[PDB]
Every structure is written in structure tokens, then in C-alpha cells.
Design an enzyme around this catalytic site. Structure first.
Site, mmCIF file in Angstrom:
data_model
loop_
_atom_site.group_PDB
_atom_site.id
_atom_site.type_symbol
_atom_site.label_atom_id
_atom_site.label_comp_id
_atom_site.label_asym_id
_atom_site.label_seq_id
_atom_site.Cartn_x
_atom_site.Cartn_y
_atom_site.Cartn_z
ATOM 1 N N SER A 26 21.890 -19.538 18.138
ATOM 2 C CA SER A 26 20.692 -18.795 18.512
ATOM 3 C C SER A 26 19.824 -19.577 19.540
ATOM 4 C CB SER A 26 19.856 -18.506 17.258
ATOM 5 O OG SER A 26 19.517 -19.754 16.646
ATOM 6 N N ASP A 27 19.914 -20.911 19.500
ATOM 7 C CA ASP A 27 19.087 -21.828 20.280
ATOM 8 C C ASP A 27 19.453 -23.273 19.964
ATOM 9 O OD1 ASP A 27 17.657 -23.006 18.082
ATOM 10 O OD2 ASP A 27 15.673 -22.414 18.873
ATOM 11 N N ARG B 264 16.989 -0.653 -0.498
ATOM 12 C CA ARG B 264 16.154 -1.639 0.190
ATOM 13 C C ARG B 264 16.375 -1.698 1.707
ATOM 14 N NH1 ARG B 264 13.305 -5.514 -3.316
ATOM 15 N NH2 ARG B 264 14.001 -5.222 -5.502
ATOM 16 N N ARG C 67 24.147 -14.512 23.966
ATOM 17 C CA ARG C 67 24.125 -13.981 22.606
ATOM 18 C C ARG C 67 25.063 -12.786 22.416
ATOM 19 N NH1 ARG C 67 18.628 -12.650 23.001
ATOM 20 N NH2 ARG C 67 17.661 -14.471 24.010
ATOM 21 N N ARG D 15 22.354 -5.348 12.153
ATOM 22 C CA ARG D 15 23.597 -5.871 12.724
ATOM 23 C C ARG D 15 24.801 -5.402 11.917
ATOM 24 N NH1 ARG D 15 22.754 -10.449 17.000
ATOM 25 N NH2 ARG D 15 23.793 -8.654 18.032
ATOM 26 N N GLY E 216 23.258 -11.300 8.308
ATOM 27 C CA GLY E 216 21.984 -11.329 7.614
ATOM 28 C C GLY E 216 21.171 -10.060 7.810
ATOM 29 N N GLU F 251 20.944 -23.101 9.434
ATOM 30 C CA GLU F 251 20.902 -21.688 9.108
ATOM 31 C C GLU F 251 20.432 -21.648 7.662
ATOM 32 O OE1 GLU F 251 24.310 -20.336 7.196
ATOM 33 O OE2 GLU F 251 23.476 -22.191 6.428
ATOM 34 N N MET F 252 20.604 -20.528 6.966
ATOM 35 C CA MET F 252 19.915 -20.354 5.689
ATOM 36 C C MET F 252 20.688 -19.647 4.586
ATOM 37 S SD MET F 252 16.167 -19.409 7.340
ATOM 38 C CE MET F 252 15.117 -19.689 5.892
ATOM 39 N N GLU F 253 22.023 -19.599 4.676
ATOM 40 C CA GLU F 253 22.842 -18.810 3.733
ATOM 41 C C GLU F 253 24.137 -19.492 3.280
ATOM 42 O OE1 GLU F 253 21.818 -17.155 6.724
ATOM 43 O OE2 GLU F 253 20.011 -16.325 5.784
ATOM 44 N N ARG G 16 30.722 -14.697 6.204
ATOM 45 C CA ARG G 16 29.421 -14.650 6.823
ATOM 46 C C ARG G 16 29.649 -14.635 8.324
ATOM 47 N NH1 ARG G 16 24.197 -15.399 7.832
ATOM 48 N NH2 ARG G 16 23.616 -17.322 8.988
ATOM 49 N N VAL G 17 28.938 -13.742 9.009
ATOM 50 C CA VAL G 17 28.902 -13.759 10.457
ATOM 51 C C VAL G 17 27.438 -13.793 10.871
ATOM 52 C CG1 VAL G 17 31.258 -12.810 10.910
ATOM 53 C CG2 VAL G 17 29.354 -11.194 10.526
ATOM 54 N N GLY G 18 26.951 -14.947 11.295
ATOM 55 C CA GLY G 18 25.569 -15.003 11.717
ATOM 56 C C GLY G 18 25.346 -16.011 12.823
ATOM 57 N N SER G 19 24.102 -16.469 12.944
ATOM 58 C CA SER G 19 23.816 -17.540 13.885
ATOM 59 C C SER G 19 23.132 -18.742 13.257
ATOM 60 C CB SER G 19 23.061 -17.015 15.102
ATOM 61 O OG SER G 19 21.847 -16.391 14.737
ATOM 62 N N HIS H 191 21.466 -4.050 -6.990
ATOM 63 C CA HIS H 191 20.993 -4.009 -5.597
ATOM 64 C C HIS H 191 21.885 -3.213 -4.629
ATOM 65 C CE1 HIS H 191 18.777 -7.404 -7.423
ATOM 66 N NE2 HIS H 191 17.784 -7.068 -6.618
HETATM 67 N N1 LIG Z 1 14.509 -12.691 -10.631
HETATM 68 C C1 LIG Z 1 13.920 -11.493 -10.827
HETATM 69 N N2 LIG Z 1 14.059 -10.946 -12.041
HETATM 70 C C2 LIG Z 1 13.519 -9.758 -12.365
HETATM 71 CL CL1 LIG Z 1 13.783 -9.059 -13.998
HETATM 72 C C3 LIG Z 1 12.758 -9.022 -11.353
HETATM 73 N N3 LIG Z 1 12.099 -7.865 -11.314
HETATM 74 C C4 LIG Z 1 11.587 -7.737 -10.062
HETATM 75 N N4 LIG Z 1 11.890 -8.812 -9.308
HETATM 76 C C5 LIG Z 1 11.513 -8.930 -7.905
HETATM 77 O O1 LIG Z 1 12.594 -8.130 -7.398
HETATM 78 C C6 LIG Z 1 13.427 -8.839 -6.468
HETATM 79 C C7 LIG Z 1 14.818 -9.066 -7.061
HETATM 80 O O2 LIG Z 1 15.436 -7.806 -7.330
HETATM 81 C C8 LIG Z 1 12.680 -10.132 -6.171
HETATM 82 O O3 LIG Z 1 11.870 -9.849 -5.023
HETATM 83 C C9 LIG Z 1 11.721 -10.319 -7.322
HETATM 84 O O4 LIG Z 1 10.483 -10.864 -6.859
HETATM 85 C C10 LIG Z 1 12.639 -9.648 -10.029
HETATM 86 N N5 LIG Z 1 13.219 -10.860 -9.838
HETATM 87 N N1 LIG Z 2 16.493 -21.852 9.953
HETATM 88 C C1 LIG Z 2 17.147 -21.226 10.954
HETATM 89 N N2 LIG Z 2 17.009 -21.747 12.180
HETATM 90 C C2 LIG Z 2 17.611 -21.220 13.261
HETATM 91 CL CL1 LIG Z 2 17.346 -21.940 14.885
HETATM 92 C C3 LIG Z 2 18.441 -20.024 13.102
HETATM 93 N N3 LIG Z 2 19.169 -19.257 13.913
HETATM 94 C C4 LIG Z 2 19.720 -18.277 13.150
HETATM 95 N N4 LIG Z 2 19.373 -18.426 11.856
HETATM 96 C C5 LIG Z 2 19.779 -17.492 10.813
HETATM 97 O O1 LIG Z 2 18.762 -16.515 11.090
HETATM 98 C C6 LIG Z 2 17.914 -16.255 9.962
HETATM 99 C C7 LIG Z 2 16.497 -16.762 10.231
HETATM 100 O O2 LIG Z 2 15.948 -16.077 11.359
HETATM 101 C C8 LIG Z 2 18.589 -16.949 8.787
HETATM 102 O O3 LIG Z 2 19.444 -15.960 8.201
HETATM 103 C C9 LIG Z 2 19.505 -17.982 9.400
HETATM 104 O O4 LIG Z 2 20.720 -18.081 8.653
HETATM 105 C C10 LIG Z 2 18.557 -19.474 11.744
HETATM 106 N N5 LIG Z 2 17.911 -20.114 10.736
HETATM 107 CL CL LIG Z 3 9.256 -6.858 -5.843
HETATM 108 CL CL LIG Z 4 22.211 -14.712 10.893
#
Ligand SMILES: Nc1nc(Cl)c2ncn([C@@H]3O[C@H](CO)[C@@H](O)[C@H]3O)c2n1
Ligand SMILES: Nc1nc(Cl)c2ncn([C@@H]3O[C@H](CO)[C@@H](O)[C@H]3O)c2n1
Ligand SMILES: [Cl-]
Ligand SMILES: [Cl-]
Ligand SMILES: Nc1nc(Cl)c2ncn([C@@H]3O[C@H](CO)[C@@H](O)[C@H]3O)c2n1
Ligand SMILES: Nc1nc(Cl)c2ncn([C@@H]3O[C@H](CO)[C@@H](O)[C@H]3O)c2n1
Ligand SMILES: Nc1nc(Cl)c2ncn([C@@H]3O[C@H](CO)[C@@H](O)[C@H]3O)c2n1
Ligand SMILES: Nc1nc(Cl)c2ncn([C@@H]3O[C@H](CO)[C@@H](O)[C@H]3O)c2n1
Ligand SMILES: [Cl-]
Ligand SMILES: [Cl-]
Ligand SMILES: [Cl-]
Ligand SMILES: [Cl-]
Lengths: 232, 232, 232, 232, 232, 232
Positions: free
Chosen positions: D202-203, D43, D216, D24, D20, D178-180, D87-90, D4
Site C-alpha cells: 500500500s505504501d 453487517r 495498486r 473488494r 479485508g 498489516e493487521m490480520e 488472505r488477499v490484502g495489502s 456472523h
Molecule cells: N465478544 C462478544 N460477545 C458477545 Cl455475547 C457480544 N454481544 C455483542 N457483542 C458486540 O458484537 C460484536 C461481535 O459480534 C462486537 O462488536 C461486540 O462488541 C459481543 N461481543
Molecule cells: N497497519 C497497516 N499499515 C499499513 Cl501501511 C497497511 N496497508 C494495508 N493494510 C491493511 O489495511 C487495513 C488497514 O487500513 C488492515 O486490514 C491491514 O491489514 C495496512 N495496515
Molecule cells: Cl455492537
Molecule cells: Cl487489506
């Protein structure tokens, strides 16, 4: 020769229809097939072989619930090398847009059975109909104009469930509840065989309304007709 | 107007194609569609609208993994009233009988994501393709002679998985591994929309062999062609 | 009157014996009871009422697996106000110290069914025999010198289990594997009724050796005898 | 060289900042670093290397959700031998005592991702920040008088969650969602690297109030400043 | 000689009574036994050996909760070859039909401890009393006319539980809540030893009413009496 | 006044040290504090209050395992309004880089206890030390040159675990195994109090080597010293 089925090598056809009720197995055989033989009486779980338009077809009762059908599916596959396994039963509709006369073809099924969690643990395994049978069954319904709906069902362990989530399932588009499909589709795929569940509506569970005897007689007969044109 | 998509009312079409890579979204739009507009640049997660044989069609990058696509699917449905959602991506084949040139149509997907366990708990929810789109996509592949396979896939949370169960999944007939389908199919059904994933083979995971640049160019193009004939 | 049992008010006795095989229900009724009536033929899942030493006693087939017996237990309790429910079946011994002629009385059962996880979630619910019936059955075995063992069993969803943990279960002292007890004991306690499973040995699972036809005939007959002296 | 990331040996620094949003990443590089090179466009998930007060520092977009960042963290560690991952996010604050201008340092994170249940099963794995980085980041905030709060966060799979438990999480002292973070901290520890998430607000999720553009801009800039003094 | 018990080979009897409170261990020894020796003071978790009607009997404090008793049970079995292990404690009644003066004999216990899920995963393991001890204890209660009830209990990890399911447990016939039985019965069976829990009522949890000091003194003394006639 | 602690209003200080062994509670009080009072003898689970450099400090035995400490932590918080709760105990090191003389400060803990799954279900809750106490304890160790390590621990339910995953935990950077921290940190955060576990090494579990009596005497004493400078 197999623990639960008293048949000898060759008595069971490549294609088996799988009602739950062994008396519906009888009914189906007597009514639809020529030259009928009963190859099994073990536990009263009748199984029959006859012909339909010149081709051998067996019909085998499965009983109710994942554990019961699993027994029959496993022995049919492993002991009798059965290739095509077609459930023909009913289910309780859980959405209003699923009509009392619709014949359902299950692409897949959700479940509260632990059978797949036992094998996979933290994986949600989604069982899959064989597409070839599904498409044939679908084409046969269309060619005749039998109303047919294609989606998912819910395979329940508990007919009487105090913790029933069917309401949430319905919002996710699930069509109805029954008690065998997950097992059929999982066991058939595991052994490289072809499986399909075709289902009629016994009732609407969230409104409580029964389907009438007449409606049941008709969708039943449509279901058998579609089943008999699903192989090839 | 929606948190993650910078589009105004009307810029997004009824039908959205859903590649993972926003650069493939661009590629697809520029290459297949007339009168192309970019309605979104938020996070570089490009989205585009153009026409194909006179009909508006949008193409929107989803990112990788259930949480990322869930964001885009939810906003497309809830904020832009999108009706048809078609994932176009790739997956790693996990069976030898799945050929490098096959175009896969997912009836359903297994997963190790907890998203459905969070909502259902002790239920294995099996997500379901919309049959209408599936059948159309299938018919379009057949009419042109594009080799097409119809079955299930596995939606993984971890591209690099030390606890990967793909080997057991393959024995159960599962075709390949990717990272979005479960979310797409679950979220679309929950809101009454139509969803389908169409996938090409990036590689064979259990043999390690890459598909060549040439093979990839061709199945990719076949996938887009099939996608553009899946609505109606 | 109840969905699965075609009996009218009063045809079913306070005490019901619960074999799995409806043909063993017949056998038992014809062989042990006077003035026998068949109150149910729905699905071939025979149920009978007769008398034994002047007292009414019913015998009702349950089918195989938790979902099947659950149906019958629920309807017997809720529709026919049945008070005493006694499973009479077999199980595969999983320890060498459990002998082919032992009659097993289950205090409790382990399971891989999700039925209790569906209701309780993060609780391991341990189902419990009614002690009064257990003790009576035990006393009756002792008074006659029938060898009897008292412990736990394992209620399995899968007769053919690739992920079978019976080996670990055996080390924890579990006696044998069958497919109904958990449901019987859970459903009876939930409604304030009395339940007991009495079981013979069909085979030793970890050695594969069948019990002979002769051994089976004898322990079966001992099991029925003990069952008929368990109420009061 | 890695699936990747299109960078060659040496283009990526020992220390990587992990926003993320790949835009940014760009912003940060252009604004904070000298002699900036873009080593990745695969990508559109931009990655950059430049210098800050004479030391090489990379900045790499992760995307959104555990599966997306896991991909980038794994390749940065395994292919480019990255040592420090920040990680630097919100995040959305879920308590009133967490103020719109607070810079959060996550000691740990809760999650509804299954990633750790897949590896550990019946263990709740608690991911852990590297203390050395945490302390440095903390010291740097203090030395400058940047308001800083040190506690836990919740790593969610679903931005739009109908089954959101954030209310219970808030009562247990959890600061925001957050999500990471769970993925970052788990993957870094597994390979003996050092990880830290630094987050702005973020809120407030339970009051719905957005943080203003001005707020922000400021907490963002404070976050970057603290990040650039966390190594050593 | 064992990590938690400071006794030498031979100081501990074949039969051990297992109160939770080490001060009740003392009380019991001083009050019921002749020729008393204290073989353990490690952690203040007193253990004693004396004789009762000429037979050696030890009494050993277990502490509170599954993890604490597990330590003591494991060392007593593995290091001192203890054969009979009898918990003597109390529990909070969770049903009105369980009376303040009843002496409870646990056939089995439910739990929210993960100990058995850690070992078995998708199996609900139901722990089982040794029947021989149970029956003896029962016979001794009957012969003296001590009111005695035989059923199941719930082994809880949390004395103060905000997510307590005792109300559902009570409807399923469960008698009371305590914090050790599951561990005792599981560990004893795993090593081929004999275990029994005998319990008095500390209070009614769903009505909040304490049992009086007088009631407690009496059922306690009855419990010890029954315990001392459970071996053989 | 509270079920398990025999103290009256005011006898217990704002800050409580929490050894597991009530005899270490005694030892600590007698050795480190002036004007010592014993406020609790219930269950031999000694608790004491005295002064250290003019400030009141209590020391309270917790017992072993999550359920035992949970009882004491809950009553100290709810009945005596305790503000600062500091576990002082030991743990078995599970990595070679954790040295026999290191004093461990737990940022967080993993667990196989179900306590948090009972409350949160499909969420992995990561408990968190109060940073203020952690930092103070850390600063005090540094100022004196006491070797100190800051990371996570594993809170186990089973001292003797046949299904122990400590080997996988060690690869993820986890420092050692003990049996209380998860409960302490979870219960303190739930009620807005401040908690910290400070731990010495009892042994290396994966090499089996005990720490010597001398090493234990020294790290113990260092641990108490650090504890007494953690408030403020
Ligand atoms: N686990 C996984 N494995 C293989 Cl061999 C893949 N080939 C394509 N994808 C798609 O490509 C992205 C990961 O490179 C994901 O969006 C996934 O849906 C794959 N994801
Ligand atoms: N669930 C969630 N909720 C709130 Cl209120 C967020 N504020 C920032 N993030 C970050 O922003 C992205 C989602 O917009 C995610 O990467 C997450 O890590 C948030 N993710
Ligand atoms: Cl794909
Ligand atoms: Cl973030
Ligand atoms: N839970 C359930 N509910 C409804 Cl409304 C049904 N209608 C038909 N069946 C089928 O009928 C049997 C139960 O009567 C099962 O085999 C099941 O597959 C049903 N099963
Ligand atoms: N799994 C299983 N295994 C063995 Cl070795 C059995 N012996 C008898 N049964 C009973 O027989 C039926 C299965 O043939 C079920 O009702 C079950 O309760 C058995 N079930
Ligand atoms: N949860 C709980 N609840 C009630 Cl109402 C109890 N009555 C006695 N015990 C026993 O007392 C101790 C807790 O005080 C535990 O050993 C437990 O086994 C109880 N445990
Ligand atoms: N599992 C475990 N293992 C090891 Cl190597 C330990 N060393 C000290 N402890 C602490 O000692 C007691 C167990 O002896 C528990 O309180 C625990 O927190 C330990 N607990
Ligand atoms: Cl049916
Ligand atoms: Cl049986
Ligand atoms: Cl007790
Ligand atoms: Cl300790």
C-alpha cells in the site's frame, strides 16, 4: 477475632471510612462522631465506631499501599460483614486542570501493582467504584457546592519511583497518584460490597508545589462531609 | 481526506454515535434523524450526518474489535475534530443480575487486548468514561424510567475464546463482554475528548440464552433514545 | 524533615532495626535499650533511638507490605544516611523442616510484587542480603546455640491470596512467606547500604497450626538478641 | 446459520479468498468469477461464491484487525467446513528492498496482538503458512514472471501506533505491516486447515510514500491471479 | 544410562565440580585428582571421577547457557543421585569494586532466562545457594587468605546482548555476568540437593579490560582449591 | 581471533553446517568432505573446513540451547562473515503425522526462550527461514525422493520441562521440539544472512518411542545430503 483487627462481633458498623493514617482515623472519629468507641489498637492501626446523625459509622486506618489496605479490607468484609467501604485520603495531582481544592471521586484506577496480574494474567482488570455511592457522594458535593471532579487515579506501589510513568498517565487523562484505590475497589467488588475512594490533593507532583496547611484543612473537611452523605 | 473516511471538512458532527455494524448506522440515521446525508462509503463502513431536534449528529460504523474501532476513533478525532464519541452496541451479559432489558453504561472496561500493555508495559491502565456524558445518559434514562445499570464491561479480542476468563470476571462484578470499549475510552481520553459506551444485552453467555428479537428491538430503541440525550 | 519521618538531623542511628508493627518498635526500644528517645510519631509509625551496650541503635516501624516499608527504607537511607538496616519480623513457615523455634536469616527473597519488573522488565532481579551482616548474625546465633536456618523467603503482596503459589515455592526450597524483605534488600543494595532480614515463625501455613504465645515470646527475644550482634 | 454469516449449508466453497474490505470482495467476485451469488449481507460484510475455470471459489470480507478476521475465519472453518483460506490484502512495506510491485507471500508473522499470549502465556507462538499453498502460489508467480518475495510480516493491532517498533522489526528482516495474518494462520492451523496470506504494498511506512493508483491496480490484479492458482 | 551422560551406576561421585568447558573438566581432573577415570565422552562433554585426599570427586562439563547446564544437572541429580553440585567458572565483573583477583561466591543470581517465569508466571523466583557449602567455601578461602567476595551475579541468555541491562544491575550491587548459575541453583533446590557457584573474573565488562593469562591461572587455581574444601 | 572460535581470517567457509554435537561435526567432515582441516578446538567445540564437489564448506558444533548456538552464530557472522548457516540436527516429533523417516524443514519456530521478549517486549517475534535455502533444500529432497515435511518447530529452553506445553503446540500444528532454531533464525536475519534448520526425528515425545539406530543412521545421512544441496 480476625488476625489484624481486635474487635468482637458487632463493634464494627456497616459503613467504614478508610483513611490511611490511623491518627486521621482518630481525628475523624473524635471530631465528627458522637459516642465514640475504639474497637482496635492492634499494631496502632486504630479503628473506631461512633454515630453521625443517629447512624453507626466506623473509621478504620488502612496503612499505606495495596498490601496493607488489602489486609484490612479483607478482614472487614469477611469477618465483620462490612457493606460500604469508603476510602478518604489524598493523592498527588498529576494534571494542572486538577485544582488544589478539588475533591476527587475515583471511577476507577490504573496500577503498577501486580495484584490483578497475579489473578488474571493476560487481562488488564479495571476496578470499578460502586456507582450508587459515587453518585450519592457526587450529589452531596453538588447540593453543597463543594467543587468535585470525577475520573480515574493511579494506584502506585512506589512513592519514590525512578521508573515513574505518571507523565504518560497524565496525558491519558489520569487525575492523580495514590496507593490504595485499586485494592479497595478490586476486593470490594470480588465480595459483592460497595466501595468508593474520595480524595483531596496533597500536592502537584509534576510541578512539586505543596498544597498549604489551610487548603489541606479545608479539602479534608469537605471530603469527610461528602463521605458522611454517600450511603443510601 | 483521512485514510478510512471519505468525508470532507465539515461533513461530520461534533457528536458521533458509534454502532459496530455499518447497517445499524444506516438504520439509526434513517430512523432517528432528519435531513440525512451519507458522508462515507469507504469499505462499506457507512457514516451519516443528520439532525435530531435541530442539532447535527453523525453516526459512524466502527467494525468489530479494538483495532477496527481504533482506526475510526483516531480519524474522527484527529481529522474531523469530533468532541463526543458514544458507542451504542451490545454485549453478552455474564451475570444473572444483569437483566435482558437493562441498558448498560460502562464506567470502565477490562481487556485482554495488548493495546495498553504496548503503551504502558507493567501498568494496568484502566480506561474511564467521561463522567459528564455518563451522568447525562444516566439522568435521561432515569427521567424516562428506562432501566439502567452502571458498571464495567470486558473488552475481548476473541469472540470465540478457548481461554475465556469471563467466569472469573463475573465474580469480580464485571457486567458483560464486548469488543470495542477499551479502545474507545483509551483513545478519547488520550486526545482530551469525551467518550461513553451504552450497551444492550445480546444474550447471557454463561447460560447461552439469546435475547428475543422483541427484547432486542426495544432495548436497542431505548439505547438510541438515551444516547440522543447524553450531550450537554 | 523527610515526608514520613518527623526526625531532625542526627536523631536516627547508623543502625536501624525494622519491625513491621510500630508497637513492637516501642516494645523493643523500652525493653532492650537505655536512654530511649522517640524521634517519630507521624502516622503512629513509631521510631526510637536508644543505646545498647554503649552504641546508638534506632528501631523503626515499617508497616506491612513492600510499598509501606519502601517508604521508610528510602527516607532512612536518603534523608538520614542510615547504613545498616535490619528487618526483625515473622513469616509463615511453608515447609515442615522449618521448625517453630528456628530463627531465619534470608539470603534472598522471591516475590509477586511488581516492583522489580517495573525497573527491570524481562529480568528476574534476585535481591541479596549483605553477607557481612548475615554472617555476623549467623555467628552470634551459633556462639549462643540459637537454632538458626539460612535460606530464602517469599515476599507476598497478598496476605489473603486465592492464587497463592506457596506450594510450588516450598518444593523449590523456599522457607516461608512474609511481605517486606524484597523491598528492604532491593532498596538497600541500590543505595550501597547493608540489609538483613531476620525472621521468626508465626505459623505453618500449609498445616494452619499457630505457634504458641510462649514459642513466639522466645523466638522473638532470640531474634532481637541476634539482631543486636549483627553490626561489625 | 453461524452468528456472523447468513449463508446456508453448501453456499460456501472449500476455498475462500479473504480481502479485508467487503467492497473488494464484491469487486473480485464480479470481475473474476462466473455465476456469482452473494451468500451474505450481514453487517455489510459481503461474501460471494462463483466459479473460476469451472471450480467453485468464495470470497469473503474479513474486516480489519485480528478480532474481526478471527470471527470470520472461525465461522468459515467450524460452520462451513472451509479447507483453504487465502488472505488477499495489502501491507505497508517497512524495508527499501521491498519494492512497490512485489507480491508478498508470508511464511509467518510477528505480532503485538495478545491473542497468542492469552493461549500460551510464556511461549512466543510463531504462526505458519501452509507450505503447499505457499509453494503453489510461488510457482504460479514464477511461471508467469510476477515478482514475488517470500518472508515475514508484522500483524499490528494499532494502525496509528505511538509505540510502533516497526523500525526494529525491519532490521530483523520483517517485510511489512498489516493487521490480520497472525489470526488467519493461527486459527487455520489450530483446526487443521490450510492458510496463506498474499499481500501487495500500500505504501512505504518509513519513507511515507504512497504507491500510485496504477501500481495498486496492477499488483492487486497480480495478487488475485496468484491466489486463483494456489489450490492443488 | 541417562540420555546425555554415558556413565553406569556408581561411576559418578556424590560431589561434582561443574566447569563449563569440558577441556577444563579434563584439565582439573588430570591436575588435581588421583586415579582418574573418564566416565563420559558423549558429545565431547567430558566427565571424570578421581580422588582428592582419599575422597571420590567427579568433574563434569556443563556447556554454556541455562539450557545446556540444565540438561547435565538434571541427569546428574535424577540418574546418578548426585548430592553436591559446585559450579566452578568465570564471570565478567560489572563493578570496579570487584577486583581481578577476587573469588566470587554467589548467594543468588538474577536472570533474563524465562525458565523461572515458565514455572512461576508472575513470581520473580530468587534461586539460593546452599548455605552450608557457601559457608565452607568461604571459611576455606579465609583460612588460606584467598580474597573472596560474597554477593549476587547475573545469569544471561545472551553473551552478545544489544539490550543488555548490566549497567542497571551494577547499580543494584550485582557483581558480574555469567550464564549458568540460575539454572544450577534452581534445579538443585527443586530436588533437595546442595549447590554453589564459585567464580573468577574473566574481564571487566563495562571497562572492556581482559584479565591477564597470569591472573587467570592464579584465580582459577584458587577457585579449584576453595571448591575442594566446600563439602562437609 | 573471536572469543570462542580459534580460527584465523579465511579458515571458515561462506556456508557452515551447524550440528549441535561437536562429535557429529567431526563425523560429518571426515565422512562427507575432502581435504579436511580442523580450524577450532576451543572448548572441544570442533569446527572443520573441507570441500564437497569442489566447494569449501565448514561444519561447526553449536552446543545445546539458544545461549550456546547464539555465541557461535554471532561470531561466525560478525568475525568470519559467514553467509549461509544451516542447522542440521534432530528434534522430538510431537505429532503422529510426523513420521520417523521425515526430514523436517523449519519455516519458523515458536519458543519459551526470552531472547526475543528481551529485544521486543510486547511483540511476539516470529523468526523466519531464508526461503531461498528452504526451497533449494526442498527441491533437492524432492528430486531424490527423500520424504520431506515443511512446517514449524518449537525451540525449548528446558529438555526436562515440568511445565511443558508441547501438547497444546501439537494441536496448533507444530511438528517437533528442539533447542536452537529460534536463535539461529533470529540472529541470521538480524545481520542479513541466510539460515535454515533441517531436522530428523530423535523420537516421538508424546508416545515416548525412540527412533531405532538404523532409522537414525538413514535420516541423518539424508539430512546431510539435503544440506549439501541447499546453497545456490
Ligand atoms: N465478544 C462478544 N460477545 C458477545 Cl455475547 C457480544 N454481544 C455483542 N457483542 C458486540 O458484537 C460484536 C461481535 O459480534 C462486537 O462488536 C461486540 O462488541 C459481543 N461481543
Ligand atoms: N497497519 C497497516 N499499515 C499499513 Cl501501511 C497497511 N496497508 C494495508 N493494510 C491493511 O489495511 C487495513 C488497514 O487500513 C488492515 O486490514 C491491514 O491489514 C495496512 N495496515
Ligand atoms: Cl455492537
Ligand atoms: Cl487489506
Ligand atoms: N504515591 C503517592 N503520592 C502522593 Cl503525591 C500522595 N499523596 C497522598 N498519598 C497517599 O498518601 C500515602 C503516601 O504518603 C499513600 O497512602 C497514598 O495513598 C500519596 N501517594
Ligand atoms: N503473608 C504473611 N503470612 C504470614 Cl503466615 C506471616 N507471618 C508474619 N508475617 C509478616 O506479618 C505481616 C502480615 O501480618 C507482614 O508484615 C509479614 O511480613 C506474615 N505475612
Ligand atoms: N555472558 C558472559 N560474560 C562474561 Cl564477561 C563471561 N565470562 C565468563 N563467562 C562464562 O563463560 C561462558 C561464555 O563464554 C559462559 O559459560 C559464562 O558462564 C561469561 N559469560
Ligand atoms: N528438547 C529436545 N527434545 C528432543 Cl525429543 C530432542 N531431540 C533432539 N534434540 C536436539 O538435541 C539436543 C538435546 O539433546 C538439543 O540440541 C536439541 O536441539 C532435542 N531437544
Ligand atoms: Cl491518604
Ligand atoms: Cl513482621
Ligand atoms: Cl565458565
Ligand atoms: Cl541436534
Amino acid at each position: 477475632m480476625s488476625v489484624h483487627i481486635g474487635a468482637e462481633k458487632g463493634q464494627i458498623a456497616d459503613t467504614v471510612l478508610l483513611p490511611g493514617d490511623p491518627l486521621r482515623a482518630k481525628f475523624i472519629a473524635e471530631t465528627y462522631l458522637e459516642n465514640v468507641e475504639c474497637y482496635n489498637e492492634v499494631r496502632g492501626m486504630y479503628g473506631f465506631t461512633g454515630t453521625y446523625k443517629g447512624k453507626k459509622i466506623s473509621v478504620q486506618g488502612t496503612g499505606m499501599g495495596v498490601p496493607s489496605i488489602s489486609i484490612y479490607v479483607n478482614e472487614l468484609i469477611q469477618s465483620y460483614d462490612v457493606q460500604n467501604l469508603i476510602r478518604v485520603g489524598s493523592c498527588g495531582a498529576i494534571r494542572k486542570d486538577v485544582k488544589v481544592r478539588d475533591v476527587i471521586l475515583a471511577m476507577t484506577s490504573s496500577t503498577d501493582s501486580q495484584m490483578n496480574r497475579v489473578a488474571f494474567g493476560s487481562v488488564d482488570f479495571a476496578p470499578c467504584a460502586d456507582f450508587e455511592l459515587l453518585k450519592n457522594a457526587y450529589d452531596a458535593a453538588k447540593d453543597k457546592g463543594v467543587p468535585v471532579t470525577v475520573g480515574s487515579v493511579f494506584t502506585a506501589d512506589q512513592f519514590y519511583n525512578d521508573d515513574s510513568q505518571i507523565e504518560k498517565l497524565a496525558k491519558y487523562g489520569v487525575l492523580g497518584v495514590e496507593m490504595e484505590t485499586t485494592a479497595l475497589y478490586t476486593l470490594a467488588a470480588k465480595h459483592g460490597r460497595k466501595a468508593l475512594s474520595i480524595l483531596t490533593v496533597s500536592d502537584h507532583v509534576l510541578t512539586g508545589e505543596e498544597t498549604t496547611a489551610e487548603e489541606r484543612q479545608t479539602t479534608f473537611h469537605d471530603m469527610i462531609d461528602v463521605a458522611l452523605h454517600s450511603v443510601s
